Amino acid sequence: MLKQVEIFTDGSCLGNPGPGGYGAILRYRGREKTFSAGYTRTTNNRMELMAAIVALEALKEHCEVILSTDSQYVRQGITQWIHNWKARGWKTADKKPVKNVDLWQRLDAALGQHQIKWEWVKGAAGHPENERCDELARAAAMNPTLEDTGYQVEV
């Protein structure tokens, strides 16, 4: 049987754009691995994506994953947009690349390596680990050490 891993993820940003960061927790057989990093200039949406990307890429073997996050952006992409973008070559009708294509492509790639059960949560009570991810993400945004290379300035 495959390992069944619990993943909790969250991202945040102080502005649009501004410093931002992510936080993710992987739970397996009582063991826990935490991941967090901050970027000098990015956006909330890119951080929401990165959290999920870093968590999934951290798994070195095919797994059963229970991914819990309150990322609306990730949810919409996963249950709505992802399919179409794969059917249009990751480009808008006007041939212009889809926003954050660099990160969406990395996520999609990570997604196809595991059986994922998504648990869309609502930032409140009953989600201790998610709240923990928020704290990690907020502490990383306040002490950024990385450059979000894939970030392209609006217009």
UniProtKB/Swiss-Prot annotation:
One of its GO terms (cellular component) is cytoplasm. SUPFAM superfamilies: Ribonuclease H-like. GO terms for biological process: DNA replication, removal of RNA primer. Its EC number is 3.1.26.4. One of its GO terms (molecular function) is magnesium ion binding. Changing D134 to H/N: Slight decrease of activity. InterPro entries: RNase_H, RNaseH-like_sf, RNaseH_domain, RNaseH_sf, RNaseHI. Residues 1-142 form the RNase H type-1 domain. It catalyses: Endonucleolytic cleavage to 5'-phosphomonoester. Mg(2+) 1 binds at D10, E48, D70. Its main location: cytoplasm. It is found in: Cytoplasm. It is an enzyme of class 3 (hydrolase). Changing N130A: Reduces activity. Endonuclease that specifically degrades the RNA of RNA-DNA hybrids. RNase H participates in DNA replication; it helps to specify the origin of genomic replication by suppressing initiation at origins other than the oriC locus; along with the 5'-3' exonuclease of pol1, it removes RNA primers from the Okazaki fragments of lagging strand synthesis; and it defines the origin of replication for ColE1-type plasmids by specific cleavage of an RNA preprimer. Involved in production of retron derived msDNA (a branched RNA linked by a 2',5'-phosphodiester bond to a single-stranded DNA). Belongs to the RNase H family. This is Ribonuclease HI. The gene is rnhA.
